């Protein structure tokens, strides 16, 4: 899994961190 600045739509599970909704990527 990813964690930082990685593309996410809402709960795309692309990252084990969280989805930063300003960049539509992870924190």
Curated annotation (Swiss-Prot):
The modification 4-hydroxyproline is found at residues 4, 10, 21. Changing residue 2 to A: Strong decrease in activity. The modification Tyrosine amide is found at residue 27. Changing residue 13 to A: Strong decrease in activity. Coiled coil: none annotated. Disulfide bonds join 1-16, 8-19, 15-26. Changing residue 17 to A: Decrease in potency, but not in affinity. It comes from the Eukaryota. Omega-conotoxins act at presynaptic membranes, they bind and block voltage-gated calcium channels (Cav). This toxin blocks N-type calcium channels (Cav2.2/CACNA1B) with a high potency (it displaces [125I]GVIA with an IC(50)=3.7-38 pM). This is Omega-conotoxin GVIA. The chain holds residues 46 to 72 of 73 of the full protein.
């Amino acid at each position: 899994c990813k964690s930082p600045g990685s593309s996410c739509s809402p709960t795309s599970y692309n990252c084990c961190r969280s989805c930063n909704p300003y960049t539509k990527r992870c924190y």
